[PDB]
Every structure is written in structure tokens, then in C-alpha cells.
Symmetry: D2
């Protein structure tokens, strides 16, 4: 699955984009 994350993607994931949610920027990670 993919996840919007703060502060960063985790081990085993790659950043594929960005989420805008709750007034913050998130890494989009899969």
C-alpha cells in the first residue's frame, strides 16, 4: 500500500510524490 508520511518514507519504501493534508506537506510513499 501507499502512505502519506511525516517526516519521511520508511525503510522499504520509495517517495513517489507529496500529500497536502491538515495544513501540512507529507511524503507520498509506496
Amino acid at each position: 500500500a501507499c502512505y502519506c508520511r511525516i517526516p519521511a518514507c520508511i525503510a522499504g519504501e520509495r517517495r513517489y510524490g507529496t500529500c497536502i493534508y491538515q495544513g501540512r506537506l507529507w511524503a507520498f510513499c509506496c
Copy 2:
């Protein structure tokens, strides 16, 4: 869980933001 969706959120969800990935815009739905 929240989900990035095209074309729109499904009944029972609301749009709380936006995902940007693979050069495309997605609704962020929870």
C-alpha cells in the same frame, strides 16, 4: 485509513486534501 483517489472520494468519505504523484492530482479521502 486515508486514500488517494481519482475521480472523487466515495460515499462515507470526505476530501481532506490532495495527493500529487506520477505527475497527477488525486483527492485525499478519509
Copy 3:
């Protein structure tokens, strides 16, 4: 002209979108 603004658009402007810049969200105002 249009401007990316924090915290908000100003008098005489309308918000038409969002900017992502310097780790922050900005109102896109014209």
C-alpha cells in the same frame, strides 16, 4: 499578477490554488 502568499490572499485578490515552496503551503492568489 498572481502571488504565492502566507498566511492568506489580500484584499482585491481571490485564492485560485496552492503553492508548495520552501517546505510550506502557500495560497495562490490573483
Copy 4:
């Protein structure tokens, strides 16, 4: 000044972010 551009920033500028408006993605160039 910074500018939202399609297709890309012009020589002498760099891309520092992204604009979202009118349902479209733009390079944010300064």
C-alpha cells in the same frame, strides 16, 4: 520574483516547488 510555469523553468531560473491551480500542476520557478 517567482513564477508558476508550464512546461518548465527558463534558463537562469531553478524549480523550487510546485503550483496547483485551475486543476493543473505548474513548476514554481525563481
